[model samples]
Target: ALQQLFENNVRWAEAIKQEDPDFFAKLARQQTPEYLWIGCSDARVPANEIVGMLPGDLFVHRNVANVVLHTDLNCLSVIQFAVDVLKVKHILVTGHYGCGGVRASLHNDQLGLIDGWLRSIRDLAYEYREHLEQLPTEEERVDRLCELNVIQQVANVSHTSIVQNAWHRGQSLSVHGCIYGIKDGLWKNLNVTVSGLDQLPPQYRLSPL
Candidate 1:
């Protein structure tokens, strides 16, 4: 993995020199990305390469679970910068099937240092366990949890103060939930697109308990 990454970087440097000598200089001038992607920090799921996007194409944030915590000022700041400052047109929450974090949430053994972080996903897993357990196999349960996590993340963006404020000002920003199938190498939209400002109720606007 280390050698591959090093080679890829070298190839990218060569590609930039061949493609555009001043690529970094041009990128330094400004970032006018129209899309913001919230994705997992997993090594397997790279935002740009997988989606065939250029350097300045997307503004991104990656967490362990690709989640949006209401009190997480860091993620909130990223969202604000992307929405209010950069004025990105779309926010996509992309989760993947067979996530290690999701798997950790399901297990009984405690992952000491990361337990608190995984606990939230665990709670969500348990809350929806009745439906998940009915699935025929372990793969199905994990798949369902992964899908639910994407939807919840999108809802988190929608429920943000910046998103709500943008809506009030007649911005065309759209929030969406999506999942990348590692097995399929394709992105599937969960159909939770929101555009109109006032369509969301007060409940959805509130923070999760």
Candidate 2:
């Protein structure tokens, strides 16, 4: 077991308490985060640290390549709770450059469940082949798809019934597509931030039920 992590936690908590006497006690009673982070499962991109946030500040759901499949109940459940209950105003779908999962999805691999999960990304690569092929090298192509994956995942988050219903009820929420540069430790907006039910087409929007 990672027993050193247990020791680290004690020291970390001790430091936090020194900063704020009742920080943990207050956090234990309630969690009132305003942002929902959907990002890759890459260890290099620790969600809270990247955003400069503390434990109770952000709700996070991470998966390989940050891909969002509508059929994925686990991810959908997190979105539902964050939007309807926590009332997180912003949902950031962030991907990263040099993502191993993103790079893997670009090739022909049969790694069971991971392959199934990454199938959608393969679809994205083919659909965006013209744009991808124009990129100078395979590395750039993978990076571009990483951005596209974030854009698509943002669309997935936006189109979910959980989010749509929130917007339908006039809840102020926005879904953003973002990419993080692991090497530079910076975040970039892919400019696909969609807010409100008005941004979606009539066919996709649900009636007030």
Candidate 3:
């Protein structure tokens, strides 16, 4: 299996060179990506391919449930590097329907340490219990919560100090939320866009002038 993966890589590389001889050469020179994607770590949700982007087109950071936890040093590090160093203009938080984490969170499944990572999803589900209870079925609730999680992560990203500092320094940055439908292979924007401190809540807009 590992051998096939490496074999596939070689073939893919050769195919790229066949199409454009200088593709990898140019890519090796620079990685000036304009967007940073925060998405779920689902094998089916390949960030670059889903967005129709080639390698080096988008910088990506993925995790379970597409969460943006303040205490997550790894995620914060990527945000800092992408914003402060790479100067990415857009930060997209994407989730998808039929997410295993979301389903587990919805049912409060005890999945060891990851249950702590999925706490945000459970909290969110609890917060919207009334609305979720009104849903006709578990599938609809999980799908709706999946979209809600993306929107919430967008807010979490906007609240991060890295993003707030970028905005305070007049960087051109925006955070957006979207959800993908696995069945339809389509993505729907949630319209939760935060461009600057002014766009966030007063409490979250604590960046110094």
Candidate 4:
């Protein structure tokens, strides 16, 4: 599968060559990517190409699905490096409609290796199931779930120590949520943005007494 991905890239590269010969030279520089993208690792949803950007333009963390688990050190590490070192101004946590992870999590069948991860979103869905079920149609329910998933991932980023710590210490960073409509080739920003401890309840802020 990995080799197949490489071969596919070779074909894609030839297309890029015909289209733009300078792309590789532009990408070969040490990257100073200014945005951290947390997105699904779906082959159909490549971050750079979908957004029409060159390589070295994005710092990314992608898994079977786009998720931000409080206990996930891997994601947290990337978040820390981006905000603290790279000083990225924006962190985009993106989901997609008709996501396999969301659909599979809703189903009873299990994906062996990823079930643990899927269970996290399943738990969120369970908590929000009442609202989701009240929707008039299957399409509306799926749409709401997809939107809620993006909102929840944004919350996940807000609650993490890295983000909360950055805020407490007066770092100016923005965490945002968005969803990709794979069918339409468009993105809808959920407009959920968290910037500082002021956004949280006074009793919960960790900055000072």
Pick the lDDT winner.
Answer: 3
Give the C-alpha miss distance for residue 157 in model 1, angstroms.
Answer: 1.1
Off by over 4 Å in 2: none
Tell me the TM-score of model 4: 0.83
TM-score for each prediction? 0.90, 0.96, 0.97, 0.83
lDDT of 4 by residue, 1-209 (tens): 59999999999888888888877877776567878999988877788877776677789899766878878889989998998787787898988888888777766787798999888778877999889778787666666777788888887887777777777677778998988988998977899988877676665455542
Query: Rank order by lDDT, top first?
Result: 3, 2, 1, 4
Q: Who is ahead in TM-score, 2 or 4?
A: 2
Clashing pairs in 2: none
TM-score of 3: 0.97
TM-score-better candidate, 3 vs 4: 3
Cα RMSD of all models vs. native, in order, equals 3.1, 1.1, 1.1, 3.2
Shift of residue 112 alpha carbon in model 3, Å: 0.6
**lDDT per residue as tens, model 1, 39-66:** 9898888888778899899999998878
Query: RMSD to the native, candidate 2?
Result: 1.1
Q: Candidate 4: which stretches are off by over 4 Å?
A: 1-29, 202-204
Q: What is the alpha-carbon lDDT for the whole of candidate 2?
A: 0.91
